[PDB]
A paper describes a structure:
The F-type ATP synthase (F1Fo-ATP synthase) is responsible for generating most of the cellular adenosine triphosphate (ATP) from adenosine diphosphate (ADP) and inorganic phosphate through rotary catalysis. In eukaryotes, ATP synthases are found in the inner mitochondrial membrane. The type III ATP synthase was detected in ciliates where it induces tubulation of the cristae membranes. In this study, we present the cryo-EM structures of the type III ATP synthase dimer and tetramer with associated lipids from the model organism [name] in complex with the natural inhibitor IF1.
Using masked refinements, the resolution of different regions reached 2.5–3.1 Å, allowing de novo modelling. The Fo-wing clamps around the c-ring, and is formed by a 55-kDa subunit [name]. Its tertiary fold superposes well with that of human mitochondrial sulfide:quinone oxidoreductase, which uses flavin adenine dinucleotide (FAD) for its activity. However, in [name] the binding pocket formed by two Rossmann folds contains the co-factor nicotinamide adenine dinucleotide (NAD). The nicotinamide group of the NAD is in close proximity to Cys205, which could potentially be the active site of [name]. The human sulfide:quinone oxidoreductase is an integral membrane protein, and [name] locates closely to the matrix leaflet of the crista membrane with several adjacent lipid-like density features resolved in the cryo-EM density map. Thus, [name] is positioned to encounter membrane-embedded electron-acceptors, such as CoQ, in a similar fashion as the human enzyme.
Author numbering: 27 to 443
The structure:
Amino acid sequence: KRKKTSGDLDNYDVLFVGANLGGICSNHFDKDTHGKYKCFVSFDQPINQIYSVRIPYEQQRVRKSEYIHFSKKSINQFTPSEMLAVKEILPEQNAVVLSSGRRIGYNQLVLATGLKHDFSQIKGFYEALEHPEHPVYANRDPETWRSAQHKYSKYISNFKSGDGYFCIPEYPYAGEVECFNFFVSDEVWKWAQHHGALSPKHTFTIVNANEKFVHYCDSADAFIKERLEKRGIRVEYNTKLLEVHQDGQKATFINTKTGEKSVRDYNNLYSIVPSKRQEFLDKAGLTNGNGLLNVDHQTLQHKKYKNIFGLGDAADLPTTKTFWAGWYQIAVVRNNVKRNLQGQTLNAHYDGFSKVPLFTGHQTLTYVAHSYGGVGNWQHLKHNNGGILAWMRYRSWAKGMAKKFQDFYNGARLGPP
Ligand SMILES: NC(=O)c1ccc[n+]([C@@H]2O[C@H](COP(=O)([O-])OP(=O)(O)OC[C@H]3O[C@@H](n4cnc5c(N)ncnc54)[C@H](O)[C@@H]3O)[C@@H](O)[C@H]2O)c1
């Protein structure tokens, strides 16, 4: 009946750059328009690691099959895709050049290029995270690990002794609140001190380069800091991890405020992988400052270039870059983009809603739900101190969310509402 559109073409009437949230949109853009347009997708990496369940992963509450998903699956069968990165974007020409060189034209462009992980900002990090024994752990799995490597789970369990550092890189970085495992670790290391598994000649400090944990929600940052103390955890601000020596287990830090670097023995290091701005977005004059797209806060349309959009993490938005945010930014992009193909006005506005669980304990969580102005809704920091209510919501996310990300990329389950 309906036939797959061509990938061997010279221009399309929509072009999506990304598969994770750029693909869920296309599958939504079709069901919203009934296939009246031919849309192309061009991602860069083959696998989509589901970082929304990254802590239930490290607890082995989610199997590796439910955490690793191919990028093709997000895209529907009809829409053609190719795993080639766009070399440059010519917005004045309405065109997009890929790595191979095949110039592609467009009518509307949707950018979901996220924040690109740059393991090389931290020298020697990747080669220590790939080692199946070294105590260097990170926010994501390398692609050379096979189905039988479960090093990720050993971070909390194998912390018998020594100095442990949890390092947060410089904003903008991916995985703000969803990759903070320093409250479940404390609980599990509070037991290990009680029966002797974890020595008392050990120190754990949070090396945060940024001044605050959550830039766009004051209430969450205040709660995190207040709760970090009540536990007894120590934080070091304005310090960022700069190098890792895998032989002697030395970690070179630098306090950007004073520019004064230190070297410290580690025996358990975790880092939230550091990102890096892509230059083809700055040669094209789209990004603003930090490297994020200069888009409207309400409609998500680019300030200049009325026909370019942007969503997800690539977009410069005053909210927490979560997934449930993007669930609301594809509903908006797929509307306006279609209103712009019909000439009509852009009637869909983004409220700034973003919802990410924060795990306060081994089996408890609280939701960070907040709109554009940092203002939280009825769930913001509820049942934060644990209890039967937070216990259940933990199971509903750990045992029941990874089973859903298959549908999202299928199409069988759409957004929350
Ligand atoms: N906790 C973490 O460390 C982490 C890291 C990445 C993503 N995430 C989650 O994923 C959610 C969605 O992320 P996103 O959609 O904003 O970005 P993303 O991290 O999912 O990646 C964006 C997609 O665009 C592709 N891409 C990047 N550069 C490209 C280029 N030059 N050309 C073509 N394709 C390119 C990528 O391969 C990818 O398919 C985020 O809200 C976040 O919750 C978390």
